[PDB]
């Protein structure tokens, strides 16, 4: 066996509405990079430091907005890097960061918002 | 003398082996003698040139430390270390 | 594509070739081997071929002085007579020598790496004899055959230098007859008038225009007949001579090729393996599959003759990182150079370098990058200029250097086929570790390599202030430093092992180096866990930042000598372990040192750090090199070296400058070197350090005197590498005959070791059957005396 | 200074497989 | 040609062409009366000069 170089698994649109409508354990990080976008080569880094760093305790994916661009329009993204922060609990409010956030800052989110 | 070829050994063999089989042929009991005569001619030929091969020896066996500048010396000295001159002038 | 491949990835996808291909391939020519009364019948089944992982690990192999091998087995059918006599058992064919993941084979405990091959290519070429026209085919076995014209063609077929037949004679030898060749040529009278592998069909094809399929592997008669037809074609001029010598017309053979030809001797040994034992079991019966009609020598023996005796395998240079990576990327024309940064073996063994397109507006291409080789491009115009350049006019018509053809010439933009982006491109390893590169001559540029490759890893390295970043791929493909293989947090680290936790399992990683990560850190999987001897923090480490001044001092730099301070020696700053047990190797006198620059020198002096110069700010400098070696050498570019090196000491700043700043602006790297200068001066308040006047020298003091040496003197911080470490020959007759002093000359010739060695010369010749007599004359008597010989 | 190379950095290529672990993984080499 | 005709022949034998002088000198029976230096330094001779 070799281990996959990348933990931050890419998800269409349909499959991310069915991992939002499904029970959750753990709060869900959807990033809408885009891959001719030049924050996004540090984003899809400080994502990948994030997803080791919670292992199982975080559910990191990301959403290319080349392909679901309708999807994050519908998600009111204005703009990439762009991170939402979905509960397991589902009465909760998402949060939508915008910008380069620290890997601190997602760190804060997840551990005290979600 | 084998001192002094302590690939010619396996010519001076074969040369050996082919004069003491015409020996045996011309004793033991003519195209055949023939035959190992000429086998013993072209194996000397090729012993001689092989030698020809080994004429090379007058200039293989008749004829035939780092060093650091010193403003310090004088232009008819130089300096000898202590770890060589110990091996120089052993005697 | 997007970035600088992994140096031994040539060595890997080579040796994943050999595996993914060359098995099925060699495998696939062992034929059925029939007995000699043709009633018993062996083969193996290739399609069964299955390679058993080593079940020694590598650092047990080393250790146990034995080879890391996978083993092959395959089964065999054997029909012993008709019907149910047949067995078709599993058999174990042999060992293979697996690879290392960077690039190297344990052989009989010692790590080999296979060097590269450069060959002529397969395929047509004609040369201008003396006007001799003169083509050639070579076929991918080195098989030449040669065709001739030297006057009103009658063109010849040439076999021997007592063999030549005209070539409508060889076709008809070949079954084609005037019909065929008058169809199929271009020129048919002319012809009436005289009454190879998948390369080679590849080149052959390419250079005739032909369009035989692949699938005809051998050449055909109508190659010979299109050899001849442009044979025409370059008597009348109708085409173009090829220069053999040119890096277009040259193959590499890898790892892979080299390993599959091992592979074929081994099997064609197999094969009267089988044929002599089959023989035995058709003569003493014997038993059927004791395992089978094989032995494991002809593979095991076959690659492990190749590794100890094979000219191209060699015991990997273990120096230091950098020549543990330059060393699998030789390129030798024995069975030399270095592949370059970018450069990749295409499928059919060309070199291939990465070229950006410039497709302008109406294809719709994805990826920009081509690959070509040598023999490629040169029928597009390559830019290595910049748009950076506007007038009344536009960016279009902007004329550039280009090259095309072989040639070089300036083109506008507008023509421009492909840009020359990525700044290594043509540099190897060891040049594009020099920093201001573009500033040395490039004669020293080779020499400057090799003194890195000679560079010995020191007790505390430490990264160089100046570099050009690819200390970071070196550190990287070295496998020097312990690069993670999973990702994960990590659990413990100490001298003995590293250990990872993540995907909710373990990991444990012994060193066999020091841990970078603090016991906290979380991993991704390929970064870098702990570094090796002769890196830090992921970088090549082969020196020291030494403080430097360039001045004569009284001699003891006198043509490139050096002078160092007494603190180099306390400081265990050149302090390297030699293993045999160590030895705590300090520096000394005698011992070199080298710049990357080519600026090396030989240590004459040590100095007390009060007697050496010392600077403005009372620091005595660490060493004392000669300026008289910039100018012999050429090697401008390391008093930038020196000047930024000092900028960054005092801006805690390293730089990493890629070659030929220049690009952007005329002066780039003087602009670099003076403002990092001021801005170290003008934060640290040293206005010593960039001193208007003269920027990047200064006034420097005795040590002895205190009094200032009245020129400025140039200073740097730049980074110094220290380097790894009877016969009485006839041109020394010749001197000391010539001096007259022939007593030391019977000395040195004589009984320093008739002479003996005159007994032996007369003695050969005696064995000669010629009588070498000596003698000599009485003067008193007339006698002849005989010598003793 | 005492910055440590981020090798899974953008201008790094992919981190090189294990040689055992890549042949393993393409089937070409066989544990048991 | 000067050398392979200069009348010292071990100073052609050691040069060039060593057995072809060599057979020629043993036909001829010649006499190399020892002086020059090259053939002298191979008998470990104190140099004729």
New interface residues.
């Given amino acids: 066996f070799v281990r996959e170089d990348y933990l931050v698994r890419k998800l269409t649109a349909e499959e991310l509405q069915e991992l939002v409508k499904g029970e959750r354990k753990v709060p869900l990080i959807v990033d809408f990079y885009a891959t001719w976008c030049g924050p996004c080569i540090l984003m899809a880094q400080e994502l990948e430091m994030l997803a080791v760093e919670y292992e199982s305790n975080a559910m990191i994916v990301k959403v290319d907005t080349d392909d679901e661009y309708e999807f994050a329009r519908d998600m009111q993204v204005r703009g990439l890097p762009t991170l939402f922060f979905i509960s397991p609990d589902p009465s909760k409010d998402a949060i939508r960061t915008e910008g380069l956030i620290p890997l601190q800052m997602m760190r804060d989110i997840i551990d005290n918002d979600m | 003398p084998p001192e002094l070829r302590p690939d010619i050994n396996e010519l001076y063999r074969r040369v050996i082996y082919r004069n003491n089989t015409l020996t045996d042929l011309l004793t033991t009991s003519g195209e055949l003698v023939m035959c190992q005569e000429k086998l013993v001619q072209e194996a000397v030929d090729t012993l001689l040139d092989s030698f020809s091969d080994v004429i090379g020896r007058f200039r293989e066996t008749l004829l035939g430390s780092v060093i650091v500048v010193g403003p310090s010396l004088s232009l008819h000295r130089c300096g000898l270390p202590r770890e060589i001159a110990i091996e120089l002038f052993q005697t | 594509t997007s970035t600088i491949p992994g140096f031994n990835q040539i060595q890997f996808e080579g040796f994943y070739r050999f595996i993914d291909q060359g098995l099925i391939e060699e495998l696939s020519k062992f034929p059925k081997i029939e007995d000699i009364d043709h009633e018993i019948e062996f083969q193996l089944f290739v399609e069964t071929y299955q390679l058993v992982e080593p079940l020694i690990k590598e650092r047990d192999a080393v250790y146990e002085s034995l080879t890391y091998s996978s083993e092959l087995y395959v089964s065999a059918g054997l029909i012993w007579k008709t019907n149910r006599n047949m067995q078709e058992q599993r058999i174990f064919i042999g060992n293979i020598p697996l690879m290392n993941s960077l690039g190297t084979s344990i052989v009989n405990g010692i790590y080999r790496v296979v060097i590269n091959q450069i060959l002529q290519s397969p395929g047509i070429y004609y040369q201008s004899e003396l006007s001799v026209y003169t083509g050639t085919i070579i076929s991918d076995w080195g098989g030449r055959l040669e065709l001739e014209i030297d006057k009103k063609a009658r063109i010849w077929a040439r076999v021997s230098r007592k063999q030549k037949i005209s070539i409508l004679v060889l076709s008809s030898a070949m079954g084609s007859n005037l019909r065929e060749i008058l169809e199929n040529v271009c020129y048919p009278e002319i012809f009436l008038s005289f009454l190879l592998g998948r390369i080679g069909r590849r080149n052959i094809n390419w250079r005739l225009n032909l369009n035989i399929p692949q699938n005809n592997i051998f050449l055909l008669p109508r190659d010979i007949l299109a050899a001849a037809d442009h044979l025409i074609g370059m008597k009348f001029g109708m085409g173009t001579l090829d220069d053999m010598n040119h890096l277009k017309n040259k193959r590499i053979r890898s790892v892979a090729d080299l390993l599959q030809d091992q592979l074929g001797l081994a099997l064609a040994r197999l094969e009267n393996v089988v044929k002599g034992t089959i023989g035995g079991a058709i003569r003493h019966k014997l038993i059927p599959t004791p395992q089978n009609l094989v032995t494991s020598t002809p593979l095991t023996t076959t690659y492990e003759s190749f590794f100890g005796l094979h000219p191209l395998s060699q015991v990997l240079d273990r120096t230091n990182p950098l020549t543990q990576i330059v060393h699998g990327r030789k390129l030798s024309y024995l069975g030399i150079g270095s592949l370059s940064i970018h450069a990749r073996i295409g499928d059919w063994g060309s070199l291939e370098s990465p070229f950006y397109e410039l497709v302008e507006k109406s294809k719709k291409a994805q990826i920009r990058m081509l690959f070509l080789s040598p023999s490629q491009d040169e029928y597009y115009m390559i830019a290595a200029g910049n748009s950076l350049a506007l007038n009344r006019g536009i960016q279009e018509e902007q004329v550039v250097p280009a090259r095309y053809r072989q040639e070089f010439l300036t083109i506008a933009w507008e023509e421009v086929h492909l840009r020359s982006i990525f700044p290594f491109q043509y540099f190897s390893i060891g040049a594009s570790l020099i920093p201001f590169i573009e500033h040395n001559d490039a004669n020293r540029a080779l020499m400057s390599s090799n003194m890195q490759r000679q560079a010995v890893p020191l007790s505390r390295s430490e990264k160089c202030i100046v570099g050009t970043g690819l200390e970071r791929q070196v550190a990287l493909d070295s496998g020097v430093p312990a690069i993670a293989e999973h990702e994960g947090k990590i659990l413990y680290t100490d001298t003995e092992k590293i250990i990872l936790s993540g995907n909710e399992n373990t990991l444990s990683i012994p060193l066999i180096q020091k841990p970078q990560v603090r016991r906290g850190k979380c991993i991704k999987k390929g970064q870098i866990l702990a570094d090796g001897a002769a890196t830090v923090g992921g970088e090549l480490a082969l020196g020291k930042n030494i403080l430097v001044a360039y001045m004569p001092w009284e001699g003891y730099n006198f043509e490139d000598a050096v002078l160092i301070s007494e603190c180099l020696v306390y400081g265990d700053i050149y302090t390297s372990f030699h293993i045999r047990i160590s030895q705590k190797r300090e520096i000394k006198v005698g011992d070199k040192v080298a710049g990357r620059h080519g600026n090396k020198g030989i240590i004459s002096k040590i100095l007390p750090r009060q007697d050496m110069p010392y600077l403005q700010d009372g620091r005595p400098v660490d060493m004392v090199f000669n300026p008289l070696g910039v100018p012999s050498r050429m090697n401008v570019g390391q008093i930038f070296e020196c000047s930024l090196g000092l900028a960054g000491s005092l801006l805690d700043r390293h730089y990493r400058i890629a070659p030929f700043d220049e690009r952007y602006e005329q002066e780039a790297s003087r602009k670099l070197v003076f403002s990092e200068l001021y801005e170290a001066s003008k934060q640290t308040a040293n206005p010593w350090v960039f001193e208007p006047e003269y920027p990047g020298k200064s006034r420097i003091f005795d040590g002895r005197t205190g009094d200032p040496f009245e020129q400025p003197v140039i200073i740097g911080k730049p980074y110094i590498l220290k380097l790894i470490h009877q016969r009485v020959g006839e041109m020394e007759v010749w001197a000391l005959e010539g001096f007259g002093v022939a007593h030391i000359l019977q000395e040195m010739l004589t009984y320093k070791s008739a002479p003996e060695s005159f007994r032996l010369l007369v003695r050969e010749l005696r064995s000669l059957a010629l009588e070498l007599n000596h003698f000599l004359v009485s003067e008193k008597n007339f006698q002849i005396n005989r010598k003793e010989v | ?26 089937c ?4 048991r | 040609r000067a050398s392979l005709n200069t009348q010292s022949f071990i100073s052609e034998a050691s040069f060039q062409e060593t057995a072809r002088v060599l057979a020629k000198a043993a036909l001829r029976g010649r006499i190399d009366w020892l002086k020059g230096l090259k053939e002298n330094v191979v008998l470990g001779g104190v140099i004729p000069a």
């Fill in positions: 200074p005492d910055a440590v190379m981020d090798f899974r950095g953008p201008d790094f290529h992919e981190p090189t497989p294990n040689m055992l672990s890549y042949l393993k993984e393409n070409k080499v066989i544990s």
